[PDB]
Structure formats: structure tokens, C-alpha cells
Amino acid sequence: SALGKLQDVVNQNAQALNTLVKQLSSNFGAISSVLNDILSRLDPPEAEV
Amino acid sequence: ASVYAWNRKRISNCVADYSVLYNSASFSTFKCYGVSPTKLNDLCFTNVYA
Secondary structure, three states: OOOHHHHHHHHHHHHHHHHHHHHOOOOOOOOOOOHHHHHOOOOHHHHHO | OOHHHOOOOEEOOOOOOOHHHHHHOOOOOOOOOOOOOOOOOOOOOOOEEO
16 A cells, blocks of 8 residues: 555545436436437337436 | 126237337327337347236
8 A cells, every 4th residue: 555646646536427327327317327228118208218 | 707707818939010009090189208219120028017
């Protein structure tokens, strides 16, 4: 732990990237977090909303 | 059966063809959500409750 600054910067960058990756798969109030399932399951008006 | 004792049926392990039901035109109301009225031929799930 003699290089705590560089390790901390790398950890913060990795944590931000992982948080974005996790947030990629959030429902956000929709019926599903997978776009392909919505498109292959739901009609174009409701699919587009 | 009555509305308070509605007949419950389980459908699985077979093949469902909703195209004939949609094209029958003998149903007054065909209303639904979560799935489009069409595009039921390429979709399937675990079980069906009627």
C-alpha cells in the first residue's frame, strides 16, 4: 500500500465503470431491462414509449 | 363457471396458435398488455393460465 494514490485512482475508475455497466441493466420503470425482449414482445407504440 | 368461481385451467407442454383466434373476428374485445395483440407465434413462456 505504498502507492495508495494510483491504486485509489484505478479503483475509482473501475468502480465508476462497473456502476455504469450495472446501471445499463436497470428497469427504469419499464416492463423489462432488456430492449430485445420488449421489441420481440410488445407493440410498436408501447415498445417505443 | 361463475365470476366468483371462475374456471381455472393450466396450459403447457403443447403448441399454442393465437393466429386463428386473432383472425376469428368473433370476439368483441381482445384487450391486453405486456404483449402485443400480434407476434404471439414467435413468443412463448413457462405456462399459460386461463
